[PDB]
Amino acid sequence: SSRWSKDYDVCVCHSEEDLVAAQDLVSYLEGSTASLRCFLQLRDATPGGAIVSELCQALSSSHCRVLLITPGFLQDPWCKYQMLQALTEAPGAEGCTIPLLSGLSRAAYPPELRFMYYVDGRGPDGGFRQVKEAVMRYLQTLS
Amino acid sequence: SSRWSKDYDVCVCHSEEDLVAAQDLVSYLEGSTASLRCFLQLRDATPGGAIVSELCQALSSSHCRVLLITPGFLQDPWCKYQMLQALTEAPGAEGCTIPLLSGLSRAAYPPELRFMYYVDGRGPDGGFRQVKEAVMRYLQTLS
Amino acid sequence: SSRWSKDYDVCVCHSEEDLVAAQDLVSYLEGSTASLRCFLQLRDATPGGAIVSELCQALSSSHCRVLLITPGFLQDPWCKYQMLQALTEAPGAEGCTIPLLSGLSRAAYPPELRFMYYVDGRGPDGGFRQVKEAVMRYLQTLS
Amino acid sequence: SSRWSKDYDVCVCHSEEDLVAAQDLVSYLEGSTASLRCFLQLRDATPGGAIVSELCQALSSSHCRVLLITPGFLQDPWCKYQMLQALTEAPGAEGCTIPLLSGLSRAAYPPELRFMYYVDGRGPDGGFRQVKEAVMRYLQTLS
Amino acid sequence: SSRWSKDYDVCVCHSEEDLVAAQDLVSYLEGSTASLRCFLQLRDATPGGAIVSELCQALSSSHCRVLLITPGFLQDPWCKYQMLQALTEAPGAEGCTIPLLSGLSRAAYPPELRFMYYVDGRGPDGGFRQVKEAVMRYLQTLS
Amino acid sequence: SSRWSKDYDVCVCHSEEDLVAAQDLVSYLEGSTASLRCFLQLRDATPGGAIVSELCQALSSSHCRVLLITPGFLQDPWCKYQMLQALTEAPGAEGCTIPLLSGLSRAAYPPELRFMYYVDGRGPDGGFRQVKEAVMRYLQTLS
Amino acid sequence: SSRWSKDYDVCVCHSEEDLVAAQDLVSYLEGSTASLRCFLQLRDATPGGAIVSELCQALSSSHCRVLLITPGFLQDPWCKYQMLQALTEAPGAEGCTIPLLSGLSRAAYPPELRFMYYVDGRGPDGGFRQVKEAVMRYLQTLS
Amino acid sequence: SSRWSKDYDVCVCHSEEDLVAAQDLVSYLEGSTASLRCFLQLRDATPGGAIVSELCQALSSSHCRVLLITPGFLQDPWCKYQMLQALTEAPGAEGCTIPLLSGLSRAAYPPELRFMYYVDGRGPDGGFRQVKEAVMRYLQTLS
């Protein structure tokens, strides 16, 4: 049905400290579907290319964006920049961006994202809130 | 009979503190019907979408609305927005909106809703007044 | 005989303070009658609807009306509205409305009802005057 | 022989103060006749009906009328109205109306009733004058 | 002489159909009097108040009462209620109430009122019987 | 000389059918005296009062009574009652009551009045026998 | 005298279609008084606030309420909510609420308001019924 | 008094197409006050900073918010983000946010804002509705 009009399916935004979080998200989303693919920075960034250009292309060439918020996310400038870029690409809360808190209380939530819903991390696993359902529904409405 | 002209049947608006009340209402109303479905904010809202838009769509896409009034309902502003939108959608007291009181005396009742009947919370359980009868009666009148 | 031209048979209007009096009247009239239903505000009126509209429909949808006059009847305004509406529906003293007095002397009797017989509350019970006889005779003359 | 062609046989008009007089008259006349029914102000009249209309119908519905003149009869206006209605229905002194006096001196006898003979109340009992003989004779003149 | 111990002198009860008759009675009685007043149902009722309460207070506050009996008086229930209340307030035929007949034969005259005199309507005019003489004489005897 | 110790001087009693006879008697008696007055039911009795009470007062508060016996007098019951009252007030044949006959033969003359002399109606007119002379003589003997 | 115990004096509830009616009422009531003030939805209700809360506060913060009933009143639900709230605030027919009919026949009158008096609209003008007299009298009974 | 406790007084959110409308609002509000200032996105946001953070601070660091809704408001996503954030910061309809429609009919009004009032633009001018009165009232209550 020519569902494949974009490069990849899911993009993950994470703080530079917890690589394991984004790796777990990709290895939890790709395994159970066998059709859905994904992009991760360290796993798929082309060596020898600019960080800014690679991240911009990664966020642009995906169907869904996933943001990982960490107590290290607030301090590190790079993940803040990538969050700003992800918001810029899809300012409307259609469903492209999926926040995922881990360790931050509701009060400490970044003020820039107080308007959209957030996938709370209080579940034993974040994926227990089934973000794959969200990405699958967005893809279904897309095509 | 093609009664299924809308996405969902019951929409529940509750204070942000005691989610257990709305969970109990849905798990008490869906189980005994075997055909009726429902909508809840924290359990059905699409992640990554706006709070305001999701609540507006949920209130619009249902057949009956239930407003859980709690001691925290007066203080919290989001449930105030929910109540105001629920009244705005169906200003007439046909039976779309069902106020379920919990812990508020008649004197402290919000003056914005003094004109309709309210399900008393003084029973052993809130459902003892059998609001499921009300929603089934409204659905029967609809079709 | 196809007598059942209307769903309900008896309506009761009572002061908001003593629910027990109206409950006693309904549970005393219903038990000894072979097939004669009734209506009461708290027991039967639909939740989520307007107080005024529901009361007006309840008075209109019945075959006979009973006004429980009590010491709290004079002070409370809602029962005053109910009495006024009951008089408005059937101004003639055919037998549609039955004033059942309780605790008010003849001197303190409301001036608006001085032209009608009233069931005296000075007996051991009000039902000892057998208002069910009055309602049964009215229904017999009806059809 | 179609002797009973109207609803009732005897009607009694009495002062509102002494229900005992009318009750005694009815319980003294009905017991020894076994066929002669009667009518009394509150014992038979329908709750929820007009005072004036019910009294007028009661006086109209009888074959013989009895006016219990009492010391409170002169002061009370309602029994005066009943007396005037009874006189109006049968102005002729045929025997339809029987004045039964109780405690009134001949000098203070009401001016409106000097035309018709009256039952003396000075005996040990009024019924010792055997007014049942009068009502029986009046019905004997009828069918 | 401080005769003005009450707000109003004459209260008129009439059928809801012919407002002109009651208006004519008021505009005929008020004009020729040196210093007198009157009350009429819709000419003087407080707007927004109860019909039953306003009529009862109007009949209570009068010095004399006039009851306009018309062919529509028998059918309409509200004027029947007014007549019953007027009779209830002063059951004695002292002169408080004055019937004024128009179009009803003596045979069809209401049974509730056969005991008092009724002002004939068969004359050239209703007021030619000079009911103002009756009300003036009642006022003179009052004080 | 304080000759007027009573409200009125002449009273006329007549059948309810022919008001013309009583009107003729009053307009024939009052005019030629220039000092005497009279009382009549339809012309002088107060409206709004009881028929029985007003008639009794009229008979009592008068100096002379005139009993107009007519062919309708026998059948009509009200004139029979008024005749009985007039006889009761003045049982003796002093001259207080004057039976003026009209159209009744001597054979059909009422048994109650065979003791008293009766004015013949068979002459050119009723007044040709000078009933005014009789009342004037009675008042002269009075005072 | 400190009669100014409240900010406003008159509140008007009207159909959303013909706001010119409420505008005319306020511009006719404010001009001739020079001391009285009023409240209207479009003219006075604060912007940026809730419709329900502002309507409730306006209804509560007034001394007298006026309900304009129009052919669009029956269909529009917001004016129905206004009517229900106005009835709820002052269920007794003291005079707080003043109906003002325009275009509705008496037969099609709202069933909820048949007990109180209503200002007719069939005259040359509604204001010719002088509702300002009613509001002035109500304030006179106040402080 | 130290009423100056915040960075700014008025914040304006507008569609990216009509900067002239927002400039007109600021130059119409600031000029007539001479003591009140305002904030605007293009006029005042620091260059070189993030868009999302700058707008979030602009909404947070002001006393009042104004949402200019236009036909281009619905299509553009950034103004939707501003609307969503403005509702998120002050969900209660106290008066913090002021909608201002221009060119959109009531039918196509954003469903998310149907509960609060809106400053309509169909009048001669939007500013003629005097939103400065609303902002002054909010500041006065703030103290």
Side-chain angles (χ1 to χ4, degrees):
Chain A
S1 299
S2 299
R3 192 187 73 83
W4 279 261
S5 163
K6 200 61 66 68
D7 294 334
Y8 298 158
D9 287 81
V10 183
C11 177
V12 184
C13 306
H14 73 110
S15 66
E16 294 293 328
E17 299 101 293
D18 51 355
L19 183 63
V20 294
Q23 189 138 33
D24 283 355
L25 264 180
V26 185
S27 310
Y28 176 84
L29 195 143
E30 279 190 359
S32 181
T33 60
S35 61
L36 272 290
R37 321 146 295 154
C38 182
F39 188 101
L40 189 151
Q41 171 179 221
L42 188 153
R43 208 265 312 277
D44 291 331
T46 63
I51 313 171
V52 179
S53 66
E54 182 65 26
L55 286 178
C56 182
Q57 188 274 331
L59 277 296
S60 177
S61 70
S62 86
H63 278 122
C64 293
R65 295 143 269 281
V66 173
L67 270 53
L68 276 163
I69 305 100
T70 313
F73 182 94
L74 296 179
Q75 295 297 109
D76 174 69
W78 271 121
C79 46
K80 274 201 294 287
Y81 163 76
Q82 177 177 339
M83 182 179 72
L84 294 164
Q85 284 275 348
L87 268 295
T88 301
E89 289 186 341
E94 319 291 331
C96 275
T97 175
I98 300 181
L100 179 48
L101 291 178
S102 296
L104 282 72
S105 63
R106 165 74 184 96
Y109 195 70
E112 301 94 19
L113 308 192
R114 293 181 184 271
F115 80 104
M116 65 183 73
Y117 273 125
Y118 63 92
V119 180
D120 188 3
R122 70 164 59 201
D125 288 345
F128 280 5
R129 287 181 61 86
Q130 184 62 255
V131 309
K132 185 254 160 179
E133 181 182 359
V135 308
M136 187 66 204
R137 282 187 293 107
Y138 186 77
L139 280 177
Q140 275 167 6
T141 70
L142 189 141
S143 175
Chain B
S1 299
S2 299
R3 191 184 71 83
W4 276 259
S5 164
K6 197 59 65 68
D7 292 333
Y8 291 129
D9 290 331
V10 178
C11 175
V12 180
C13 293
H14 70 106
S15 58
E16 308 311 299
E17 295 102 295
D18 48 355
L19 169 76
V20 296
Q23 283 184 353
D24 285 354
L25 265 180
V26 184
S27 296
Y28 176 85
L29 188 153
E30 279 190 358
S32 179
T33 53
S35 59
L36 276 291
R37 75 279 190 191
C38 172
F39 189 99
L40 197 145
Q41 168 178 41
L42 188 144
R43 197 273 306 277
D44 297 2
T46 71
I51 312 173
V52 190
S53 66
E54 183 66 26
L55 272 67
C56 182
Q57 188 274 331
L59 269 295
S60 176
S61 71
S62 87
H63 278 121
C64 292
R65 294 143 269 282
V66 173
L67 294 170
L68 272 163
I69 296 100
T70 49
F73 189 97
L74 296 178
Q75 295 298 109
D76 178 71
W78 273 119
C79 49
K80 276 199 293 287
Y81 170 83
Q82 293 179 356
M83 182 179 72
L84 293 166
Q85 280 276 348
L87 277 296
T88 289
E89 288 188 341
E94 319 291 331
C96 275
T97 175
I98 304 168
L100 181 50
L101 269 284
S102 295
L104 280 74
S105 64
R106 170 75 182 96
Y109 191 73
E112 293 83 3
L113 281 173
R114 276 194 226 271
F115 82 109
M116 50 183 60
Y117 291 166
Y118 67 111
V119 186
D120 300 333
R122 268 68 177 171
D125 282 332
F128 263 64
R129 306 295 299 179
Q130 184 62 255
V131 298
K132 183 248 167 179
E133 180 183 359
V135 299
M136 205 149 286
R137 280 190 293 107
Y138 193 62
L139 293 178
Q140 274 165 4
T141 66
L142 287 174
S143 296
Chain C
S1 299
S2 298
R3 178 263 170 274
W4 287 266
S5 172
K6 187 59 186 67
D7 300 334
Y8 282 132
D9 290 78
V10 192
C11 175
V12 173
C13 292
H14 73 290
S15 50
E16 310 312 299
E17 294 101 296
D18 46 354
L19 294 174
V20 297
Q23 289 182 356
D24 284 353
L25 266 184
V26 185
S27 178
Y28 177 84
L29 195 155
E30 279 191 359
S32 179
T33 51
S35 296
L36 287 179
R37 275 69 174 174
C38 173
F39 190 96
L40 184 56
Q41 170 179 40
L42 188 153
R43 212 267 311 276
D44 291 331
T46 74
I51 311 170
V52 188
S53 179
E54 214 65 24
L55 291 175
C56 182
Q57 183 66 41
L59 277 296
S60 175
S61 68
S62 66
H63 279 299
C64 292
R65 293 144 270 279
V66 172
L67 303 151
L68 274 160
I69 297 101
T70 49
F73 193 98
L74 295 177
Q75 295 298 109
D76 178 69
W78 274 118
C79 48
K80 279 197 292 286
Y81 165 81
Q82 293 179 356
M83 147 173 78
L84 294 186
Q85 278 274 347
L87 287 175
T88 297
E89 290 186 341
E94 321 291 330
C96 277
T97 187
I98 307 168
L100 178 46
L101 267 285
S102 295
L104 274 66
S105 64
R106 171 75 182 95
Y109 190 69
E112 293 83 3
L113 288 165
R114 270 201 218 290
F115 77 113
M116 293 177 70
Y117 291 166
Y118 61 108
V119 185
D120 299 334
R122 309 143 198 181
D125 283 323
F128 264 67
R129 302 294 300 180
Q130 184 62 255
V131 298
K132 189 256 159 180
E133 179 183 359
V135 307
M136 186 66 204
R137 283 192 287 108
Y138 171 106
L139 297 176
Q140 273 167 3
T141 67
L142 193 143
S143 294
Chain D
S1 299
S2 313
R3 176 181 178 171
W4 287 281
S5 66
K6 181 68 174 66
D7 289 333
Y8 283 128
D9 290 331
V10 194
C11 176
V12 296
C13 294
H14 71 105
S15 44
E16 312 312 299
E17 296 100 295
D18 47 353
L19 294 174
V20 295
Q23 285 173 347
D24 282 354
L25 268 187
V26 184
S27 180
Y28 178 85
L29 192 164
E30 278 190 359
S32 181
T33 47
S35 61
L36 272 294
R37 53 204 187 245
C38 170
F39 193 97
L40 188 153
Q41 172 176 41
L42 61 83
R43 212 271 308 272
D44 307 357
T46 78
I51 313 173
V52 189
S53 179
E54 264 286 348
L55 293 175
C56 199
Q57 188 274 331
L59 277 296
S60 176
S61 66
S62 88
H63 274 122
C64 291
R65 293 145 270 281
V66 172
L67 298 154
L68 277 160
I69 299 102
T70 52
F73 199 102
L74 297 177
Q75 295 298 109
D76 179 69
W78 271 113
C79 51
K80 275 198 293 287
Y81 167 78
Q82 305 182 226
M83 182 179 72
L84 294 174
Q85 287 290 324
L87 276 154
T88 300
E89 291 184 342
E94 320 291 330
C96 278
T97 187
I98 320 180
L100 179 46
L101 271 290
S102 296
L104 277 296
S105 63
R106 168 73 182 95
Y109 188 72
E112 305 93 19
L113 294 174
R114 270 137 172 151
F115 77 111
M116 184 54 179
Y117 291 167
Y118 64 92
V119 194
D120 301 333
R122 70 173 64 200
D125 276 329
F128 286 168
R129 302 294 300 178
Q130 184 62 255
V131 298
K132 186 253 164 182
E133 180 183 359
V135 300
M136 186 66 204
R137 281 190 292 110
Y138 182 88
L139 294 174
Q140 271 167 5
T141 74
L142 305 184
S143 177
Chain E
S1 299
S2 297
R3 172 194 95 81
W4 275 266
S5 164
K6 194 59 209 82
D7 292 334
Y8 286 119
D9 290 331
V10 194
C11 175
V12 184
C13 294
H14 71 106
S15 66
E16 311 312 298
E17 297 101 294
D18 48 355
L19 295 174
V20 295
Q23 281 183 353
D24 284 355
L25 265 184
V26 186
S27 306
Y28 181 88
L29 202 170
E30 278 190 358
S32 179
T33 56
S35 179
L36 278 80
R37 74 281 191 191
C38 167
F39 192 98
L40 183 61
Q41 171 179 39
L42 61 83
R43 207 267 312 273
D44 295 324
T46 75
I51 315 171
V52 189
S53 179
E54 182 65 26
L55 294 174
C56 200
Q57 188 274 331
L59 277 296
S60 175
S61 68
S62 88
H63 275 301
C64 292
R65 304 186 304 276
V66 172
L67 266 162
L68 272 162
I69 297 101
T70 49
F73 192 99
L74 297 179
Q75 295 298 109
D76 177 68
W78 273 112
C79 52
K80 274 200 293 287
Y81 164 81
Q82 304 178 38
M83 150 191 75
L84 303 202
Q85 279 274 347
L87 281 149
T88 296
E89 290 185 341
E94 320 291 331
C96 276
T97 187
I98 303 171
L100 181 46
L101 271 287
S102 295
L104 282 72
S105 64
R106 167 75 184 96
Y109 186 63
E112 293 84 3
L113 282 72
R114 276 162 163 111
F115 85 107
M116 65 183 73
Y117 291 168
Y118 65 108
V119 186
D120 296 332
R122 277 82 181 274
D125 274 324
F128 282 170
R129 303 295 300 178
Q130 184 62 255
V131 298
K132 188 254 166 184
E133 181 182 359
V135 298
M136 187 66 204
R137 267 168 321 142
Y138 183 106
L139 296 188
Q140 272 169 5
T141 68
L142 189 141
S143 162
Chain F
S1 299
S2 299
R3 300 178 187 171
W4 280 271
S5 179
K6 195 60 65 68
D7 292 333
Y8 281 118
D9 290 332
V10 194
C11 176
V12 183
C13 300
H14 71 100
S15 63
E16 308 312 299
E17 293 102 295
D18 48 353
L19 277 296
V20 293
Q23 287 168 348
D24 280 354
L25 267 187
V26 183
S27 178
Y28 181 86
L29 194 144
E30 278 190 358
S32 180
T33 59
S35 60
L36 277 296
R37 281 82 65 193
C38 169
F39 192 96
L40 188 152
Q41 169 179 41
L42 188 152
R43 204 271 308 276
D44 291 331
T46 76
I51 312 171
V52 189
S53 179
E54 265 286 348
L55 284 175
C56 202
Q57 183 66 41
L59 277 296
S60 176
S61 69
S62 86
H63 274 123
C64 292
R65 294 144 270 281
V66 173
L67 272 188
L68 280 162
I69 298 102
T70 50
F73 197 102
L74 297 176
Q75 287 69 240
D76 177 69
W78 273 114
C79 48
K80 276 197 294 288
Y81 164 79
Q82 184 177 182
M83 182 179 72
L84 293 177
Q85 282 273 348
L87 277 185
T88 300
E89 290 185 342
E94 320 291 330
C96 278
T97 187
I98 317 182
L100 179 47
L101 269 289
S102 295
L104 273 80
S105 63
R106 167 72 184 95
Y109 187 65
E112 296 84 1
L113 271 74
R114 270 153 172 121
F115 74 103
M116 183 50 185
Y117 263 110
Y118 69 111
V119 188
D120 297 332
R122 321 167 293 107
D125 274 323
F128 263 62
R129 306 294 299 180
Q130 295 297 109
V131 291
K132 184 256 154 182
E133 179 185 359
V135 298
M136 186 66 204
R137 284 187 295 110
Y138 174 72
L139 294 174
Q140 272 170 6
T141 67
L142 190 141
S143 162
Chain G
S1 299
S2 299
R3 191 185 71 77
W4 273 272
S5 178
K6 191 60 213 93
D7 293 332
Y8 282 122
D9 289 333
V10 176
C11 175
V12 182
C13 293
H14 71 101
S15 66
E16 310 312 298
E17 298 100 294
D18 48 355
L19 188 153
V20 296
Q23 183 66 41
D24 285 354
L25 266 183
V26 187
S27 296
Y28 176 83
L29 183 60
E30 279 191 359
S32 181
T33 54
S35 59
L36 275 295
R37 72 280 191 190
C38 171
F39 192 100
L40 196 142
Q41 169 178 41
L42 187 153
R43 204 272 308 277
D44 295 333
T46 67
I51 313 174
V52 189
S53 66
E54 262 288 345
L55 267 61
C56 176
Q57 188 274 331
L59 266 292
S60 175
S61 66
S62 87
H63 279 122
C64 291
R65 294 143 269 281
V66 171
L67 306 152
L68 277 160
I69 300 102
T70 49
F73 186 96
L74 295 176
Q75 295 298 109
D76 177 69
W78 273 113
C79 50
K80 275 200 293 287
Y81 167 82
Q82 293 179 356
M83 182 179 72
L84 295 167
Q85 279 275 348
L87 286 201
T88 314
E89 288 188 341
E94 320 291 331
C96 277
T97 177
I98 305 169
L100 182 46
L101 273 290
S102 295
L104 284 73
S105 63
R106 164 74 183 95
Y109 189 68
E112 293 83 3
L113 297 165
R114 270 153 172 141
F115 79 113
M116 65 183 73
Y117 273 113
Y118 67 116
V119 183
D120 298 332
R122 278 80 61 192
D125 273 324
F128 284 169
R129 299 296 302 178
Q130 184 62 255
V131 298
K132 186 256 161 180
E133 183 70 16
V135 310
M136 186 66 204
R137 280 189 292 108
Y138 184 92
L139 299 194
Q140 271 165 5
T141 71
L142 281 181
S143 186
Chain H
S1 300
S2 301
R3 190 179 70 85
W4 281 266
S5 163
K6 197 61 67 69
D7 293 334
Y8 285 120
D9 292 79
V10 177
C11 176
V12 181
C13 291
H14 70 108
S15 65
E16 311 312 298
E17 298 101 294
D18 48 355
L19 183 63
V20 296
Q23 286 168 348
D24 283 354
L25 268 184
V26 182
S27 301
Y28 175 84
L29 190 149
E30 277 190 358
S32 179
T33 55
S35 58
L36 279 298
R37 76 281 191 192
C38 171
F39 192 97
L40 183 62
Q41 168 181 220
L42 188 153
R43 209 266 310 276
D44 291 331
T46 64
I51 308 172
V52 189
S53 66
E54 261 287 347
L55 279 71
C56 182
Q57 183 66 221
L59 277 296
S60 177
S61 69
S62 86
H63 279 122
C64 294
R65 297 141 270 281
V66 173
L67 300 166
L68 276 163
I69 307 107
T70 56
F73 190 97
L74 296 177
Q75 295 298 109
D76 176 68
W78 271 118
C79 48
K80 273 201 293 288
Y81 167 82
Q82 308 178 39
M83 182 179 72
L84 290 186
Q85 284 275 348
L87 275 296
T88 303
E89 291 180 353
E94 321 291 331
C96 277
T97 187
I98 320 176
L100 179 45
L101 288 179
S102 295
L104 294 174
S105 63
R106 166 77 182 96
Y109 188 64
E112 303 93 19
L113 285 152
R114 277 201 227 271
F115 83 107
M116 65 183 73
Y117 293 101
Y118 63 91
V119 179
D120 199 74
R122 290 184 184 174
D125 272 323
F128 284 169
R129 301 297 303 178
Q130 184 62 255
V131 298
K132 189 249 177 182
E133 181 183 359
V135 310
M136 294 298 102
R137 279 188 287 100
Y138 183 83
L139 296 194
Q140 273 164 5
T141 67
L142 189 141
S143 295

